[model samples]
Target: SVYDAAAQLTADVKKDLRDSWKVIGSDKKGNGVALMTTLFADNQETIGYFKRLGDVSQGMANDKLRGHSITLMYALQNFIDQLDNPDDLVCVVEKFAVNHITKKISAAEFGKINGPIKKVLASKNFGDKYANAWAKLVAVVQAAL
Candidate 1:
């Protein structure tokens, strides 16, 4: 549905996401920070949007980058943990949308995440299953935004 097509993700895909996210989330292999840092570094123009997190000019050492990265991992882990429930995912997206709106985050800026996320996800071992699954789910995140 237009409301959120990520519900299309399969059970196997969900599992792939679970195993893969465990590695990417920084809770296990510790790459979540690097991944987040890459996103900011590459999207330097978007850095100021996170001014509350820290000065974009300050670079990756910005406290906001560190804090938000961990927070993002935990938040995403929450979504991954409940991948089987579409309603749960909807709720998760809704929560972030509310926050982003209050923070004045634009739809286009939020939408930019989908590409880099998939790009980073492509480097992992989970392969297409996880990649497609994340794509579907992240699409839902975009729609919600």
Candidate 2:
């Protein structure tokens, strides 16, 4: 179930990003090219985070939620590393909730998916600048169903 949910969420995130890119004209080459360049520079760091998360989750013995959370964290971090603004990330996350989580899953069920993620995320030192970014991401997903 966790794997299924995580897969669905991941697909939803990808869809949301694609849809938002159209609405915000982010697909254009020059509108925010500089910002996009800056964001892309952090790709290595984002990749490192995902690798660590994958290792951590893979080592866990039983908690399926751990794996799911790791997957979601990677997806969210990748989104943040791509988008120049926090609002854009929030919009994408919110769209993910509406289209996938709320429509396909129940609120109580979704909370179970989100709870471990919140705990894992809060326990990490993501730095001060990313506080709101992380919060907005979690809030958007948790608020879906």
Candidate 3:
């Protein structure tokens, strides 16, 4: 499923680039030719594999991060879970953001996933730290791509 999602995202980006190139009067041949002539052309074919590698790497990073978050959550839940105040959840999130997320995640990759994270953070009332971390993570993945 992750591969499929990544494939779709890659295809969408490539399609958008192709469409923009068309608008710039680049013919299919010219567009293709230009890409072939680029210094990174030889490595472009390997992009998908490298992207997958990055995803795997990120997964490991995420696991480590998640473990930290879960520990924090468990501790917070233990202490504050009994609180009748809903606002206390904010402190839990803030703690996770500062201690676990922003500390471990990359800003570039977080920026790359800004769109998705915005939607999520909006509902959760999370801060820009999450976005920054996710963007860095996505950047790392994209660089591999």
Candidate 4:
């Protein structure tokens, strides 16, 4: 219960997400691509933010895009790993936010990914509890951002 109670990432929810992440978050580049791909599909405005990643239109084959995507996935893995210590996770996300802020990425831009992430989880059919747990993780990151 020490986590940010506002985000609702409780112990049970943490356990649920941790169990599902082995499959969903394990493929670093795969999940990253899925995330940004879904995000771009859902909100085209997001593409402008990652212009330096070299051609959002290029999709999967772009090396810069793939590299950043993998890094983002690793960040997610790190967040899930630190769920037990909600404050720690919060700090990490907040620090990560600074990098994005320099690139003109506000919380609103970061918020755009939530729906895409949930859609990915839905397609995976990992069960409702698992999905709910991921929602909490998203909430925590959004709150931090």
Q: Compared to the true structure, candidate 4 yields what TM-score?
A: 0.86
Clashes of each: 1, 0, 16, 0
TM-score of 1: 0.78
State the displacement of the C-alpha of residue 69, model 1, in Å, after optimal TM-score superposition.
1.0
Candidate 4: stretches off by over 4 Å:
1-7
Q: How much lDDT does each candidate structure score?
A: 0.68, 0.41, 0.35, 0.75
Query: TM-scores for all candidates?
Result: 0.78, 0.33, 0.24, 0.86
lDDT of candidate model 2 versus the reference: 0.41
Best by TM-score: 4
Alpha-carbon deviation at 121 in model 3, angstroms: 1.7
Give the TM-score (vs. native) of candidate 3. 0.24
Q: Can you write out model 2's per-residue Cα lDDT over 1-145, one digit (the tens) per residue? A: 2222333334445444444434333322232322222322433332232333343323334244354444544554555454554455555666666755534555544444333323333334323333333333444456545
Model 4, 25-48: lDDT tens digits are 868788788888889888987777
Candidate 2: which pairs clash?
A: none
Model 3 Cα lDDT, one tens digit per residue, 1-145 = 2223223334344343233323322232322222222312333432342232333223224444334334433442332332233244334434444542433443343233345443444334545654444343234233322
Find the 10 residues in a row with the least total lDDT in model 2: 27-36
Show pairs that collide, candidate 1: 53-64
* Stretches > 4 Å off in candidate 3: 1-112
